[PDB]
Amino acid sequence: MLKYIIPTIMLMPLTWLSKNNMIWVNSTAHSLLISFTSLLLMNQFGDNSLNFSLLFFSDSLSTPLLILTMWLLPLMLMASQHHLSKENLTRKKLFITMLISLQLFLIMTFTAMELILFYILFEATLVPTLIIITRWGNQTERLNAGLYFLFYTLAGSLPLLVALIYIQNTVGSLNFLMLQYWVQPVHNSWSNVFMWLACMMAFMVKMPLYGLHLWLPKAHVEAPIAGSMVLAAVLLKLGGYGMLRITLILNPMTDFMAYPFIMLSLWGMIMTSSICLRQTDLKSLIAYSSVSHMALVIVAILIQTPWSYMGATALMIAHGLTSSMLFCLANSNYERIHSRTMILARGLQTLLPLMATWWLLASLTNLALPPTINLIGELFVVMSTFSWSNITIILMGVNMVITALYSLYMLIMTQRGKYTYHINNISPSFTRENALMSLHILPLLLLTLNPKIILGPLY
Amino acid sequence: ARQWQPDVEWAEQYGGAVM
Amino acid sequence: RWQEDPEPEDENLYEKNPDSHGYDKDPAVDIWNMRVVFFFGFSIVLVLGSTFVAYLPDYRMQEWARREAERLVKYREAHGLPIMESNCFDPSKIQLPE
Amino acid sequence: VVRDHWVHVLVPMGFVFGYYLDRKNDEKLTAFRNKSLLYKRELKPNEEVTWK
Amino acid sequence: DSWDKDVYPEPPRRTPAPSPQTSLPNPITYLTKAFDLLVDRPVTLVREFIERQHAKNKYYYYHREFRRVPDITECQEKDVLCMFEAEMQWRRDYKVDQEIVNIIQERLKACQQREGESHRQNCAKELEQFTQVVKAYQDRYHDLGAHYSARKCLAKQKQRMLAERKAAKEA
Amino acid sequence: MNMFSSLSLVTLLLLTMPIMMMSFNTYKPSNYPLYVKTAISYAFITSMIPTMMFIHSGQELIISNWHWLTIQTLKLSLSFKMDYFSMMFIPVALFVTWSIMEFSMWYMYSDPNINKFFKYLLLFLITMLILVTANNLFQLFIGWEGVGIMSFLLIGWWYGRADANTAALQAILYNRIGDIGFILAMAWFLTNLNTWDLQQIFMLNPSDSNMPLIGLALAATGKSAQFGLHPWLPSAMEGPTPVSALLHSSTMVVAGIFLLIRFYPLTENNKYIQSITLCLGAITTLFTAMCALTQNDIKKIIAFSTSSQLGLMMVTIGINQPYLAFLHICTHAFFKAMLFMCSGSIIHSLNDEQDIRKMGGLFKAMPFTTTALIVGSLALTGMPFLTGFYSKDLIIEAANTSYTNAWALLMTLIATSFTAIYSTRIIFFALLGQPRFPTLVNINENNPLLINSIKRLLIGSLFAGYIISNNIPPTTIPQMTMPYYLKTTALIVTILGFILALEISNMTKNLKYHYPSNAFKFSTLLGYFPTIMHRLAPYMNLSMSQKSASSLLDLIWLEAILPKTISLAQMKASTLVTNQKGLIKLYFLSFLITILISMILFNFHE
Amino acid sequence: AYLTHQQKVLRLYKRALRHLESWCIHRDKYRYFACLLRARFDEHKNEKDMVKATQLLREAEEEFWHGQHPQPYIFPESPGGTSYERYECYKVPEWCLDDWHPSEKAMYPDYFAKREQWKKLRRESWEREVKQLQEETPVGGPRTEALPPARKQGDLPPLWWHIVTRPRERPM
Ligand SMILES: CCCCCCCCCCCCO[C@@H]1O[C@H](CO)[C@@H](O[C@H]2O[C@H](CO)[C@@H](O)[C@H](O)[C@H]2O)[C@H](O)[C@H]1O
Ligand SMILES: CCCCCCCCCCCCO[C@@H]1O[C@H](CO)[C@@H](O[C@H]2O[C@H](CO)[C@@H](O)[C@H](O)[C@H]2O)[C@H](O)[C@H]1O
Ligand SMILES: CCCCCCCCCCCCO[C@@H]1O[C@H](CO)[C@@H](O[C@H]2O[C@H](CO)[C@@H](O)[C@H](O)[C@H]2O)[C@H](O)[C@H]1O
Ligand SMILES: CCCCCCCCCCCCO[C@@H]1O[C@H](CO)[C@@H](O[C@H]2O[C@H](CO)[C@@H](O)[C@H](O)[C@H]2O)[C@H](O)[C@H]1O
Ligand SMILES: CCCCCCCCCCCCO[C@@H]1O[C@H](CO)[C@@H](O[C@H]2O[C@H](CO)[C@@H](O)[C@H](O)[C@H]2O)[C@H](O)[C@H]1O
Ligand SMILES: CCCCCCCCCCCCO[C@@H]1O[C@H](CO)[C@@H](O[C@H]2O[C@H](CO)[C@@H](O)[C@H](O)[C@H]2O)[C@H](O)[C@H]1O
């Protein structure tokens, strides 16, 4: 992985040694070049994962997440450089450094072969993320949002640290390849019930699981746009990726420990979808949309079927691009009217016709219009949960209906109707804003032509 | 608007003898 | 109260630069920023990357598995053997308990 | 080398350097080169190692 | 021809010879002649040109041959080096068996379309063959879960072998 | 097979080129609508060649040209089934779309976004053809939801209108509720039969097919707007009249019936499903026709007519007559599209007036629109040997000679009489009597685009039914022996409706004032279903979203029982620890206590 | 209700005639019944007792509710009509033209020359318009939404821009 780790680090010298007026051009261009080379990770085999060294390996699960992560860095740079224009030069370079360091921790997190190396990097992403939210957020509440984000995560992570170290003691290793062959079954006992909880609660909080999700709408509403992009696109998927790996050693206890969390997700997804119908804040609506989508991922990981794992892998990638696009779309409105109130600026399709096309495409992927990968992921999950229990189609069906209602409600309220009279600073969409939107939707729609590369190890 | 920063009311939360 | 700077007005990048791409205030930097985003983003990553992905060699050996299965079905049907046996492992190599 | 374009070699060199280091790691993991049951064979007349 | 007629069998074709019972000209006859003249001939020549260039640059590719290694039954407990090879072999065979079921399914579906309204009686062999192979595939691989392995497959077989033994004991 | 397969694909590839030229800015933006209209005309020609080949020898084939994705033992390929149902529907849909597009060129002339309008109409058709030719359930689902989204964008064409946005969203709501059954059918078929391809489903022929077929019936209920999920189709009248013509004759609303037709190998063996669909169609055909008797919006009457006719097709499915239902789909497309286009001609000439109470005296003022309107009405009411007689008449005689629910048969017959009554209403009020429109007369139906587009559908409404019935192969045993009174039931109840409808219409002229009956209000207000359900369901769900889901749980209880309680406890403990006197005497006195309890209670000294 | 008694009766009369028209449809039949309905209003036209007059209004409204047409006629462009707000998607505020690219403005040199005069006329008049509203408004703010006319020559009626420059009812 050094062909990706090292050039990612070299982005830091590049940013700091760039001319004062070229920090965005240089960092954006060279982070796109790194994104290009990440496609070499798709040298995947039918039987064996791609194991580079004792430290790093890349299978079909981590490969698409790595490519999503490295694609997101250039997009985040494009999305931030407007609202950071008045920033002090050094504080602009420190902002970019926080994003580069986040990418560094992320690509190492997704390829760590040892679970305790995964834990440290998994935890290391907190610091740059927290600093972005609290230093470069705009509102007073960004400070409270930082604390909720920090302490929700740590409340779960610290038990996970104890469980992993206990697992290394008893099994002798935490290398994920070794665990595949040395895994022993988990037999019922209160001791194992809490080993199971410690291994899964840290990841449940990151997804987040319904009930434990309150940190997420706070963080999104306060984060800067680049922070919201990485939060929704990648950092949520650290929970999913971690769960997909650790469940290997939790069998067969996962048979009955899953029930309380499937119930929370199946019911929680209807509850958070319905919350979206009455949200007044556009960013908060998108945040609650992520909770509903990630509920499906939690259910799919817990029912442990080949179809559900394929569906979860596609959902994580599809959600990553769609939710990131939606936050970017809402941000472009915010940079004009400087409010997140959804009902404030209406009828924008009249004033920004092409940006209204992006709003349409983003909404269609969010409601999972076939054959988007949003629909492929969501459909595969629904097929597998139906076999788990037929009655789940009722809850899946209702969520699909409510998901369409709030997706098109967001489209209709902001883009259609009459424009707000007194709002007269809706300038024409910039090239930067249109290119940012297209760099989200075009790769998302292109992946429909070749969806096998985002279906994960069980394809 | 512009980014919020602590004002005097906020700063006085940390000027007392105790929190 | 205190001695504080008032909230500055909103700068419309189009006023000074009607051809602004929204990247930079400097028109020359603004053009270069647009060029690298479009060339490296669309012309390279999206166009070449899409072409690279389309021609990936037998991603995860799905084609070989189909060719191999054809070989086995041809052989087994000719020799009268079952297309597929219920037992994955030879039962002579297994020692049941009891 | 120019006064405007020397910073543009850092990331490309980092990739080349990382690529080089990645291949050196494979030199430490040859304990089973031409020894696995699946791929073990005889060397060709000029070959010295099945892979390097 | 292009594929193997044994793996993908097609029953011999039987086409009734035209028996026009009307004086009128048949529109399909002339459109067919136009299609051959206007579409088939130019498309055929363009292909023959391309087939000439390929014949001047003939090169080959091969179907990989995988030697057989000891399966998971012969591996000592927690011996990763032997487990790894048996595990990888079992994974390769799992993919191949998936495509075997696809081939048998493809035969079944081709028969259903080919036979039309008579498919119910004329695709009994294909249905029977499909039913048997799906039973074998289900026995090998069904209910193993996302984290399937050669070990879980073996444990499932042993459990099945035990049940068959006990019923045989009842006989 | 070379010509058959090549030609049936260019038909589909042809329709996409205007889409490709559009989104790739290689076209000639001058007269894009005529370009899109020309492409549809040529695609009709190319689709006739495969249809003739099927008519000749019954040639059918499946084309699986591209392998898209393999999920273990489920291979998904882009597949196109060119069978009986695809070869007849495609030329009919293109023929009607050819007229509608030519009609739209005149109707939408002043629309500034006419180029986008024709692009959406073309996508609307493309997604319908994907639906009709889909050979597996996933590819079919692409077309299923494509027409739904295209319908949403066209109903809400005038997006500054709040009522058009409500109608557009309402169509999605009702069709998504239907889509629960579609997903259910997919899940059952994958689980129990390990396939989504229509071939394997029919070869395996499941016996316990109650669950998958209920899912398909639920999906058909939403798409075809049967009772329970019906209100959205009349509300879909918000869209421009060309949308209504295409939405109701082809594209969307027929997909529901088509789905059930495609699965007749399963339904023909499940009597339980037949009983449900028959009752479902019978209430639908009766209720919607009952609502049309008192509607005054000319488009809402025709909208309710379509729901009534769709209910009839659902009845035909319910009596195990899938091919008659298909024939009615084809014949209905002709005169229903014409009726909508004729109403558009009237609405345009009367400066966007759609209330029949404000028309009249147009019989002579608009002669060609009047001829088409009368032909369309007679075709709809099964006049002998017009296009509507060859499907509808056979359906009724099969209905009363079958082993059927007696109530559904009686409901179906009464609705057939209601069809004549509301058809009489449109003619009597729009065309007869004295004019009731404003004084500045601008009636003008002399545009050749308007005349030609209606002229082509008028010929179809006269002969298309005769032509088709004489060319399709026979796939059943038509029932031709029956009592004289069962033979002529369709004709007589239609005539009686005409007579009664005429008497009712004449009473409006008398100088009498009557208070409305509860029955009159019930019909006018659509059985209060939209009034009650479109206030009660939105209110309860939306109120629960804010009050309980958000505030009570997310902003209160999920906060209280964890972060707010934990942080308060820590704040309390901090105060106990740190609130000290700073007195040497007290600290050392506590050292003595610590030492004593250390020895006495915990025996730390042992 | 801020409507006087006279306004309520006149409003009820109009609303009753329109619903009567929906019932009758035919113009001759409507004319016959509209005259009988008018005769009923003329019957109590001179009722000088407010208590009785108000009581007559209550019963009249009660009768209208029972007899109202469930689906009355609505003018197409009237609230609730089939063309209400049909053209809002085409109405674009005039301030959108300040953002036009110069190459777009160069296509209409004469239109944008005139537009500048209006914008010039708007700046010059604004100060006097604010002043006029300051001098005519009593302490405690206005009590009605009525606005004054201009009182001098060269003055424009205060708050005129968004009435004068509002989009055409059939813009595109
Ligand atoms: C979000 C929170 C989710 C909470 C999920 C709760 C799951 C509850 C699991 C309960 C079952 C625990 O597992 C159970 O533990 C006891 C440990 O004493 C084991 O039993 C053991 O202790 C019991 C004493 O109670 C003895 O009677 C028994 O002889 C001994 O073997 C059981 O063999 C095992 O079946
Ligand atoms: C394989 C790796 C490839 C890496 C590719 C990286 C692409 C980066 C593209 C940026 C190119 C910009 O190159 C640019 O050239 C000119 C001339 O030397 C420099 O100097 C220029 O500064 C300003 C721009 O603000 C100009 O108005 C001025 O005319 C010129 O002096 C710029 O400072 C430099 O930024
Ligand atoms: C995978 C695709 C395979 C086939 C590709 C074939 C490419 C051939 C491109 C031809 C031009 C297509 O693009 C478009 O075609 C039509 C008709 O031809 C032209 O349109 C012209 O004819 C039509 C109808 O006769 C008129 O509506 C239009 O006013 C006129 O300009 C457009 O000016 C041209 O921009
Ligand atoms: C399958 C297709 C079936 C098509 C059936 C077509 C309609 C069948 C004929 C229906 C009745 C014909 O019409 C019959 O004769 C005359 C019409 O001149 C009507 O006579 C009426 O005409 C005038 C019209 O101004 C009325 O004001 C008057 O009250 C009344 O005398 C009769 O009330 C009616 O009974
Ligand atoms: C879900 C299981 C794990 C959960 C672990 C969560 C631990 C707690 C993390 C957040 C700690 C924040 O600690 C503190 O919380 C309170 C409210 O909660 C905030 O205070 C805010 O709410 C309180 C009460 O609602 C008000 O009195 C106060 O005026 C307001 O500012 C503080 O600004 C914050 O500093
Ligand atoms: C599963 C274990 C999870 C462990 C998580 C880590 C716990 C960290 C605890 C930090 C506690 C200190 O946080 C403290 O909380 C109280 C909330 O009562 C806040 O206090 C706030 O609410 C109280 C009452 O609601 C007000 O009187 C006060 O004016 C207001 O500031 C403090 O401003 C904050 O400083």
Side-chain angles (χ1 to χ4, degrees), chain F residues 185 195 232 270 361 380 407 504 518 601 603:
Chain F
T195 191
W232 70 268
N270 182 322
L380 169 68
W407 194 234
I504 305 181
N518 288 346
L601 281 184
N603 286 30

PDB file of all heavy atoms in Angstrom, chain F residues 185 195 232 270 361 380 407 504 518 601 603:
ATOM      1  N   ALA F 185     -43.068 -10.030  -5.149  1.00  0.00           N
ATOM      2  CA  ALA F 185     -43.042 -11.077  -6.159  1.00  0.00           C
ATOM      3  C   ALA F 185     -41.614 -11.442  -6.539  1.00  0.00           C
ATOM      4  O   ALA F 185     -41.295 -12.621  -6.709  1.00  0.00           O
ATOM      5  CB  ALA F 185     -43.832 -10.635  -7.388  1.00  0.00           C
ATOM      6  N   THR F 195     -34.844 -17.675  -9.606  1.00  0.00           N
ATOM      7  CA  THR F 195     -34.779 -17.016 -10.899  1.00  0.00           C
ATOM      8  C   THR F 195     -35.628 -15.757 -10.893  1.00  0.00           C
ATOM      9  O   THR F 195     -36.528 -15.587 -10.069  1.00  0.00           O
ATOM     10  CB  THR F 195     -35.246 -17.947 -12.017  1.00  0.00           C
ATOM     11  OG1 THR F 195     -34.940 -17.361 -13.283  1.00  0.00           O
ATOM     12  CG2 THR F 195     -36.735 -18.173 -11.922  1.00  0.00           C
ATOM     13  N   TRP F 232     -55.199   8.538  -7.931  1.00  0.00           N
ATOM     14  CA  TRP F 232     -54.115   9.278  -8.563  1.00  0.00           C
ATOM     15  C   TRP F 232     -54.347   9.486 -10.053  1.00  0.00           C
ATOM     16  O   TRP F 232     -53.898  10.495 -10.604  1.00  0.00           O
ATOM     17  CB  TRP F 232     -52.786   8.565  -8.335  1.00  0.00           C
ATOM     18  CG  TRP F 232     -52.661   7.299  -9.080  1.00  0.00           C
ATOM     19  CD1 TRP F 232     -52.994   6.065  -8.640  1.00  0.00           C
ATOM     20  CD2 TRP F 232     -52.165   7.133 -10.407  1.00  0.00           C
ATOM     21  NE1 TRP F 232     -52.738   5.132  -9.605  1.00  0.00           N
ATOM     22  CE2 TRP F 232     -52.229   5.765 -10.704  1.00  0.00           C
ATOM     23  CE3 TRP F 232     -51.675   8.010 -11.376  1.00  0.00           C
ATOM     24  CZ2 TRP F 232     -51.821   5.251 -11.921  1.00  0.00           C
ATOM     25  CZ3 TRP F 232     -51.271   7.496 -12.585  1.00  0.00           C
ATOM     26  CH2 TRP F 232     -51.351   6.131 -12.848  1.00  0.00           C
ATOM     27  N   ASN F 270     -54.369 -20.779 -10.658  1.00  0.00           N
ATOM     28  CA  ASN F 270     -54.674 -20.346  -9.298  1.00  0.00           C
ATOM     29  C   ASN F 270     -56.060 -19.714  -9.317  1.00  0.00           C
ATOM     30  O   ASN F 270     -56.220 -18.565  -9.737  1.00  0.00           O
ATOM     31  CB  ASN F 270     -53.614 -19.378  -8.789  1.00  0.00           C
ATOM     32  CG  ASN F 270     -53.864 -18.930  -7.371  1.00  0.00           C
ATOM     33  OD1 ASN F 270     -55.000 -18.705  -6.972  1.00  0.00           O
ATOM     34  ND2 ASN F 270     -52.798 -18.793  -6.601  1.00  0.00           N
ATOM     35  N   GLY F 361     -73.015  23.756 -28.253  1.00  0.00           N
ATOM     36  CA  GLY F 361     -73.114  24.334 -29.577  1.00  0.00           C
ATOM     37  C   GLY F 361     -71.881  24.169 -30.427  1.00  0.00           C
ATOM     38  O   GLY F 361     -71.695  24.920 -31.385  1.00  0.00           O
ATOM     39  N   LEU F 380     -66.065   3.471 -27.874  1.00  0.00           N
ATOM     40  CA  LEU F 380     -65.946   3.167 -26.453  1.00  0.00           C
ATOM     41  C   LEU F 380     -67.125   2.344 -25.959  1.00  0.00           C
ATOM     42  O   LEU F 380     -66.954   1.424 -25.152  1.00  0.00           O
ATOM     43  CB  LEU F 380     -65.832   4.467 -25.662  1.00  0.00           C
ATOM     44  CG  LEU F 380     -65.945   4.379 -24.144  1.00  0.00           C
ATOM     45  CD1 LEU F 380     -64.754   3.646 -23.568  1.00  0.00           C
ATOM     46  CD2 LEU F 380     -66.060   5.766 -23.555  1.00  0.00           C
ATOM     47  N   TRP F 407     -72.012 -11.458  -8.369  1.00  0.00           N
ATOM     48  CA  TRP F 407     -72.007 -10.023  -8.119  1.00  0.00           C
ATOM     49  C   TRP F 407     -71.078  -9.293  -9.079  1.00  0.00           C
ATOM     50  O   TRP F 407     -71.401  -8.199  -9.550  1.00  0.00           O
ATOM     51  CB  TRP F 407     -71.598  -9.745  -6.679  1.00  0.00           C
ATOM     52  CG  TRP F 407     -71.872  -8.350  -6.255  1.00  0.00           C
ATOM     53  CD1 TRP F 407     -70.989  -7.475  -5.711  1.00  0.00           C
ATOM     54  CD2 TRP F 407     -73.125  -7.661  -6.333  1.00  0.00           C
ATOM     55  NE1 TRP F 407     -71.607  -6.283  -5.443  1.00  0.00           N
ATOM     56  CE2 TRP F 407     -72.921  -6.370  -5.818  1.00  0.00           C
ATOM     57  CE3 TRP F 407     -74.397  -8.011  -6.788  1.00  0.00           C
ATOM     58  CZ2 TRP F 407     -73.939  -5.427  -5.743  1.00  0.00           C
ATOM     59  CZ3 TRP F 407     -75.406  -7.073  -6.714  1.00  0.00           C
ATOM     60  CH2 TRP F 407     -75.173  -5.799  -6.194  1.00  0.00           C
ATOM     61  N   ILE F 504     -82.295  11.750 -18.903  1.00  0.00           N
ATOM     62  CA  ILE F 504     -81.706  12.527 -17.814  1.00  0.00           C
ATOM     63  C   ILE F 504     -81.148  13.840 -18.337  1.00  0.00           C
ATOM     64  O   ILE F 504     -81.304  14.892 -17.706  1.00  0.00           O
ATOM     65  CB  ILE F 504     -80.623  11.705 -17.092  1.00  0.00           C
ATOM     66  CG1 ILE F 504     -81.198  10.377 -16.605  1.00  0.00           C
ATOM     67  CG2 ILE F 504     -80.033  12.495 -15.929  1.00  0.00           C
ATOM     68  CD1 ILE F 504     -80.206   9.521 -15.860  1.00  0.00           C
ATOM     69  N   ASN F 518     -78.267  12.457  -1.778  1.00  0.00           N
ATOM     70  CA  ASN F 518     -77.038  11.905  -1.227  1.00  0.00           C
ATOM     71  C   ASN F 518     -76.285  11.116  -2.285  1.00  0.00           C
ATOM     72  O   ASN F 518     -75.051  11.146  -2.330  1.00  0.00           O
ATOM     73  CB  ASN F 518     -77.351  11.024  -0.020  1.00  0.00           C
ATOM     74  CG  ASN F 518     -77.778  11.827   1.192  1.00  0.00           C
ATOM     75  OD1 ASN F 518     -77.612  13.044   1.233  1.00  0.00           O
ATOM     76  ND2 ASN F 518     -78.348  11.150   2.179  1.00  0.00           N
ATOM     77  N   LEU F 601     -12.919  -2.505  58.253  1.00  0.00           N
ATOM     78  CA  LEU F 601     -13.862  -3.013  57.263  1.00  0.00           C
ATOM     79  C   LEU F 601     -13.196  -3.909  56.229  1.00  0.00           C
ATOM     80  O   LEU F 601     -13.698  -4.997  55.936  1.00  0.00           O
ATOM     81  CB  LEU F 601     -14.565  -1.853  56.555  1.00  0.00           C
ATOM     82  CG  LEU F 601     -15.709  -1.159  57.287  1.00  0.00           C
ATOM     83  CD1 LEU F 601     -16.332  -0.119  56.377  1.00  0.00           C
ATOM     84  CD2 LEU F 601     -16.757  -2.151  57.756  1.00  0.00           C
ATOM     85  N   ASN F 603      -9.790  -4.914  56.173  1.00  0.00           N
ATOM     86  CA  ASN F 603      -8.694  -5.753  56.653  1.00  0.00           C
ATOM     87  C   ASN F 603      -7.487  -5.661  55.727  1.00  0.00           C
ATOM     88  O   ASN F 603      -6.815  -6.653  55.441  1.00  0.00           O
ATOM     89  CB  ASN F 603      -9.144  -7.208  56.807  1.00  0.00           C
ATOM     90  CG  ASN F 603     -10.037  -7.419  58.010  1.00  0.00           C
ATOM     91  OD1 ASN F 603     -10.773  -6.525  58.417  1.00  0.00           O
ATOM     92  ND2 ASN F 603      -9.982  -8.613  58.581  1.00  0.00           N
TER      93      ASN F 603
END
